Amino acid sequence: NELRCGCPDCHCKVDPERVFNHDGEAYCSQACAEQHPNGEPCPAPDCHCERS
């Protein structure tokens, strides 16, 4: 299915040894997993997930 981030428009590279599984889904960062609680987007400075 191609390892993809739970975010609707996010597809950053996810690493198994640090995979953030939240509610059974994988995310690229702890930010996407928690729907960006600290208001912090993901490490990708060009990504627009949750922004748009």
42 binds Cd ion (CB under 5 A): yes
Instruction: Please report, for residues 20, 21, 41, 51, the alpha-carbon distance to residue 24 in angstroms, rounded to integers and kept in the order given.
Output: 9, 6, 20, 23
> Do the annotations mark residue 7 as ligand-binding?
yes
> Do the annotations mark residue 10 as ligand-binding?
yes
Residues 1-40 as x/- pattern, contact with Cd ion by CB under 5 A: ----x-x--x-x---------------x---x--------
> Do the annotations mark residue 47 as ligand-binding?
yes
The pair of three-digit structure tokens given for residue 26, joined into one six-digit string:
């994988």
Least distance between Cd ion and beta carbon 43 (Å): 7
User: Which candidate, 36, 38, 18, places its Cα nearest to that of 28?
Assistant: 18
